[PDB]
From Swiss-Prot:
Exists as an auto-inhibited monomer; this state is maintained by intramolecular interactions between the NB-ARC and WD repeat domains. In vitro, at high protein concentrations or in the presence of non-physiologically high dATP concentrations, assembles into homooctomeric rings 300A in diameter to form the apoptosome complex; two rings can interact face to face (via CARD domains with some involvement of the WD repeat beta-propellors) to form a double ring structure. The octomeric ring may represent a non-functional or off-pathway conformation. The chain holds residues 938 to 1246 of 1440 of the full protein. Main component of the apoptosome, an adapter protein complex that mediates activation of the caspase cascade in programmed cell death initiated by the intrinsic apoptosis pathway. Recruits the initiator caspase Dronc, promoting its autocatalytic cleavage and activation; triggers the caspase cascade upstream of the effector caspases Drice and dcp-1. Effector of reaper, grim and hid induced cell killing. Produces at least two isoforms that may activate distinct caspases by separate pathways. Possesses an N-terminal caspase activation and recruitment domain (CARD). At high protein concentrations in vitro the CARD domain mediates the interaction of two octomeric apoptosome rings to form a double ring structure. Possesses a NB-ARC domain (nucleotide-binding adapter shared by APAF-1, certain R gene products and CED-4) that forms the inner hub of the apoptosome ring and is the main mediator of oligomerization. The interface of the NB-ARC domain and a neighboring helical region forms a binding pocket that can accommodate a nucleotide tri-phosphate with specificity for dATP. In its monomeric non-activated state the binding pocket may be associated with ADP. Disruption phenotype: Pupal lethal. Reduced apoptosis during neuronal development results in central nervous system hyperplasia; a larger number of differentiated neurons survive in late stage embryos and third instar larvae have larger brains. Delayed removal of the larval salivary gland due to defects in induction of apoptosis. Imaginal discs of the eye and wing are enlarged. RNAi-mediated knockdown significantly reduces levels of apoptosis and caspase activity during embryonic development. This is Apoptosome protein Dark. It comes from the Eukaryota. WD repeats lie at residues 182-210. Induction: Induced by ionizing radiation including X-ray and UV.
Length: 231
């Protein structure tokens, strides 16, 4: 699912081919969105939700606005008020929310636990890394990266710096950087790739990536508007 600048790639799991309405679609698995109104259709997901409860992740739905709207519910609307901006959400009915603060929060869709530690974060509910020091609460101040835009856990938790890096935690092996996700085989030092870093597509400045299996079978999406579908 890719917002109209609502398309596909020979599949029916997100939008009926051509569906003009967006900022981001949701096919995490009706592909959710947020207008500059939630315009979600049915091509293959659940077929009907229309305009019901921006950046939505899995609902084994929750919203994400530019305000303190940590709302997230069913169709049942629940505007959990974080009390500035409700930033990056992740699903771990508990859902972790990460504002423009490294402390962050865990809210059960009701705040499960809330932590405060200093003056992108991974999933392994208490074993969670924090970035903006590299403290991993349950904590461990790790000021090794000069800041910290993303961190991801063991497939040795690798955390990127704003000036490349994606070092080791528990040797700073170096190839903003190309951000990271986890494999059963570490995605080669949690970089997404530097070929195969030992433990190039068109243009650069990639955002967020995933992967099917070790090395091969990229999940496409690689850059803006033009990414390889090779491997």
């Amino acid at each position: 699912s890719g917002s109209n600048s609502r398309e596909i790639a020979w599949v029916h799991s997100a939008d009926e081919i051509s569906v003009m309405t967006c900022l981001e679609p949701n096919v995490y698995l009706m592909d959710m969105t947020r207008e500059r109104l939630l315009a979600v259709d049915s091509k293959e997901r659940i077929h009907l939700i229309k305009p019901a409860i921006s950046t939505i992740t899995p609902t084994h739905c929750k919203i994400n606005a530019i305000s303190a709207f940590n709302d997230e519910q069913i169709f049942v609307d629940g505007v959990i008020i974080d009390v500035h901006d409700t930033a990056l959400p992740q699903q771990f009915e508990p859902i972790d929310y990460l504002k423009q603060v490294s402390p962050n929060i865990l809210v059960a869709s009701a705040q499960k636990t809330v932590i405060f530690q200093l003056e992108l974060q991974p999933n392994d509910l208490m074993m969670d890394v924090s970035t903006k020091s590299l403290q991993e609460g349950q904590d461990h101040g790790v000021c090794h990266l000069d800041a910290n835009p993303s961190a991801f856990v063991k497939p040795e938790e690798y955390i990127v710096g704003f000036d490349l890096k994606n070092s080791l935690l528990f040797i700073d092996v170096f190839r903003i950087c190309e951000e990271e996700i986890a494999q059963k085989a570490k995605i080669s030092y949690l970089v997404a790739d530097g070929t195969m870093l030992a433990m190039f597509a068109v243009e650069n400045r990639k955002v967020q990536l995933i992967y099917s299996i070790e090395e091969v079978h990229e999940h496409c999406i690689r850059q803006l508007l033009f990414s390889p579908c090779k491997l």
